[PDB]
Amino acid sequence: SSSAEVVDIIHKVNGYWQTNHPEHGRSFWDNAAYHTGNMEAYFLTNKPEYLEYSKGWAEHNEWKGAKSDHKANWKYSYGESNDYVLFGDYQICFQTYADLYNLEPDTHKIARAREVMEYQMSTPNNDYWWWADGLYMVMPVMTKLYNITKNPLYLEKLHEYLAYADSIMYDEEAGLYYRDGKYVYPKHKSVNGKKDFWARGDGWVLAGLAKVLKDLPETDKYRQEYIDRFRTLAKSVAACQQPEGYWTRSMLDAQHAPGPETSGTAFFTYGLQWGVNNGFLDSAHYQPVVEKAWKYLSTVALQPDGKIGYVQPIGEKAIPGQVVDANSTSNFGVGAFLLAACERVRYLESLIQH
Numbered sequence: 001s002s003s004a005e006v007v008d009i010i011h012k013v014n015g016y017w018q019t020n021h022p023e024h025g026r027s028f029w030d031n032a033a034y035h036t037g038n039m040e041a042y043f044l045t046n047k048p049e050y051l052e053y054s055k056g057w058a059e060h061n062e063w064k065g066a067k068s069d070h071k072a073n074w075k076y077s078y079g080e081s082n083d084y085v086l087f088g089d090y091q092i093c094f095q096t097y098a099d100l101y102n103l104e105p106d107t108h109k110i111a112r113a114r115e116v117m118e119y120q121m122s123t124p125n126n127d128y129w130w131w132a133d134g135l136y137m138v139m140p141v142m143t144k145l146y147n148i149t150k151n152p153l154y155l156e157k158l159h160e161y162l163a164y165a166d167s168i169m170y171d172e173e174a175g176l177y178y179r180d181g182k183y184v185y186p187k188h189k190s191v192n193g194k195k196d197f198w199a200r201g202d203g204w205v206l207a208g209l210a211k212v213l214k215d216l217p218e219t220d221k222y223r224q225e226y227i228d229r230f231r232t233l234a235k236s237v238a239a240c241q242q243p244e245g246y247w248t249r250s251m252l253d254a255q256h257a258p259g260p261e262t263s264g265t266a267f268f269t270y271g272l273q274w275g276v277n278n279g280f281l282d283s284a285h286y287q288p289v290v291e292k293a294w295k296y297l298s299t300v301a302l303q304p305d306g307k308i309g310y311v312q313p314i315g316e317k318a319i320p321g322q323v324v325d326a327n328s329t330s331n332f333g334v335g336a337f338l339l340a341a342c343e344r345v346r347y348l349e350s351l352i353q354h
Contacts, residue, residue, distance in 0.1 A: 001348075001353075002348045002351075003345050003348035003349045006341055006344050006345050006348065007044075007045065007345055009298065009302065009306075009341055010041055010044070010045065010338060010341045010342065010345070011045070011047070012305075012306035013302070013306045013308060013334060013337060013338065013341070014037075014038065014041050014050065014306075014334075014338060015306060016305055016306030016307055017034070017306070017331075017334045018049070018050075018053055021331075024056055024057040024060040024061075025057075025060075026061065027057075027061040027064065027065045027066075027090065027093040028065075028080060028089060028090060028093075029088075029089035029090070029092050029133075029137055029332070030314065030330065030331045030332050031057070031331055032092040032093040032095070032096065032137075033092060033136075033331060033332035033335040033336070034331035034332060034334055034335040035054050035057060035093070035095075035096040035335070036092070036095055036096065036335055036339070037334060037335030037336065037337070037338030037339050038050055038053060038054050038335070038338065039054055039095075039096055039099045040338055040339055040342045041338050041342060042054070043342075044342045044345060044346075051103070054096055054099075054100060055100060057096070058093075058096060058097055058100055058109070061093065062112075063097055063108055063109050063110075063111065063112055064093075064112040065085060065090035065091055065093050065094065065112070065116065066081070066082045066083065066084045066085040066087070066090040067082040067085075068082045068083045068085055070083070071119065074086045074119075075087065076088075076128055076130075085116055086116070086120055086128065088128065088129065088133075088134040088137040088138040089133075089134070089137055091113075091116065091117070091137055091138050091141055092136070092137040092138070092141070094110075094112075094113035094116075094117070094141045094144075094145070095140050095141055095144060097109050097110055097112075097113055098110055098113060098141070098144035098145060098148060099144070101148065102144075102148070110145070110148065113141065113145060114145065114149070117141060117142070117145060117154070118151075118153075120157075121153050121154070121157045126160055126161065126163075126164045127164055128161050128164075129161045129162065129164060129165040130164075130165070130168070130180065130181070131169075131179065131180040131201075132165070132169055132177045132178065132179050132180065132198070132201040132202065132204055132205050133179075133200070133201060133204040134165070135162065135165060135204060135205045135208040135209070136204035136205065136207055136208035136211075136267075137204075137208075138161070139158060139162065139208045139209070139211065139212045140208060140211040140212060140215070142154045142155065142157065142158035142161075142212075143155075143158065143211070143212050143214075143215040143216050144215060146158075146215075146216075146217075147215055155216070155217075155220055155222070158212070158222070159222040159225070162226075166229070168180075168181045169181060170229075171184075171185070171195065171197075174195055174197065174236060174252075175232045175233060175235060175236030176195075176197040176202055176233065176236050176237070176251065176252075177197065177201060177202050177205050177233070178196075178197060178198075178201070179197075179198040179201040183196055183197075183198070190250045190252070190253035190256040191253070191255070191256045191320055192253050192255055192256060194250070194252045194253040194256070195252055196250050196252070196253065196256070197250065197251040197252060198249065198250070198251070198264075199247040199248060199249055199250075199251050199261055199263075199264025199265070199268075200249075200261075200263045200264045200267070200312060201264075202233070202237060202251065202264065202267075202268075203247075203263060203264040203265070203266070203267025203268050203271070203336065204267060205233060206230070206233055206234065206237060206267060206268060206270075206271035206272070207267040207268075207270050207271045207274075207336075207339065209226060209229065209230040209233065209271065210230070210270065210271045210274040210275060210278075212226055213226060213227065213230060213275075213278065213280060214274070214278070227280055230271075230275060230280055230281075231275075231280065231281065234271070234272060234275055234281050234286065237251075237268050237271075237272065238272065238285070238286060238289045240252055241268075241289055241292065241293065242254060244260070244292075244296060245265075245292035245293050245294075245295050245296035246260045246261060246262075246264075246265045246293070246296045246300075246310075247261065247264045247265050247268060248261060249261050249264070249312055249318075249324075251264075255320060256320060257318055257320065257322075258320070258321065258322070258323055259310075259323035259324060260296065260300055260301070260310045260323070260324065261310055261311070261312050261324050262297070262301040262308060262309065262310040262311045262312075262324075262333055262336070262337065263311050263312060263330075263332060263333045263336050264312075265293055265296060265297065265301075266297060266301075266333070266336035266337045266339065266340045267336045267339070267340075268293060269290055269293040269294055269297060269340035269343075269344075270336065270339035270340045270342075270343050272286050272289060272290050272293070273286075273290050273340070273343040273344060273346075273347055274343050276290065276347070277343065277346055277347055277350070290344075290347075293340075294340070294344055297337065297340060297341075301337070302337075307327070307329050308329050308333050308334050308337045309325075309326045309327050309328060309329060310324050310325075310326055310328060311324070311328045311329050311330045311332075311333030312324055312328070313325070313328050313330065314330070
């Protein structure tokens with residue numbers, strides 16, 4: 001069966017990753033993004049080893065992101081040190097902590113998540129989500145913690161923080177997000193004069209919006225705004241897919257940074273399939289796009305031992321003419337791939353069995 005083949009891929013991929021990473025590292029975004037994918041695979045397949053792997057990581061990180069208790073030193077610009085408690089890259093771990101709590105509730109699992117987010121929400125600042133990726137990192141924290149606490153402030157602040165991000169990064173004409181406020185046209189252009197939208201950036205946003213819509217109460221007063229943006233972003237994403245099924249690093253300018261890239265493509269394949277499967281996106285319009293994307297992921301990105309290649313690396317240096325390393329993988333790329341694959345299983349299992 002088509003669905004069973006994709007389940008087998010999920011186990012090959014996730015097994016490869018876990019085999020090659022027996023030791024856990026820090027709670028920061030790249031590891032945390034992998035865990036969002038591992039949790040998805042656990043929800044789909046119930047394989048006990050997957051749950052154990054995320055529990056081990058959470059325990060290793062003491063159910064915390066950045067560790068500082070000195071609130072006056074807490075920062076939300078980029079940093080990797082323990083003062084960066086309010087930086088969303090140190091909050092995506094809370095998504096996994098909340099998931100683990102939901103399976104086996106224990107106060108300590110979400111204590112830090114609640115302490116940090118509730119302090120953040122008490123501050124006047126509206127500008128916590130100042131880069132596109134932050135939307136994936138933190139929006140689902142707000143919805144997951146709402147569903148646990150039933151504290152409406154989480155949903156009010158989800159709106160306030162996203163409204164800020166949208167105001168700076170969303171291009172209404174193009175229907176896509178800039179990676180941050182420095183990349184806006186016309187001051188910045190791609191090397192061939194196009195608007196420059198980073199594929200992984202928009203991937204984070206589309207996938208993040210899918211996760212918000214998954215868990216947000218159907219009655220939430222801001223839900224229609226999120227749906228509306230999800231639909232606009234999806235349409236623009238679909239429109240700039242390459243003929244080969246992937247999205248290039250600069251979504252609207254294939255020559256700027258040529259050739260395949262996996263992480264953006266995988267996040268889009270998740271978000272678009274999720275939106276079709278959950279009644280927000282037009283099936284007939286989007287399914288062909290998803291099919292071309294999955295074809296790329298399964299044939300070109302995926303290696304037969306389970307390695308996920310063509311992932312744009314964090315440290316990349318690149319100029320026009322140069323492609324991504326076929327053998328480039330990462331934690332967050334595997335996470336994105338797992339999201340896409342899991343959602344594909346859900347789609348395939350919906351189809352009539354003849």
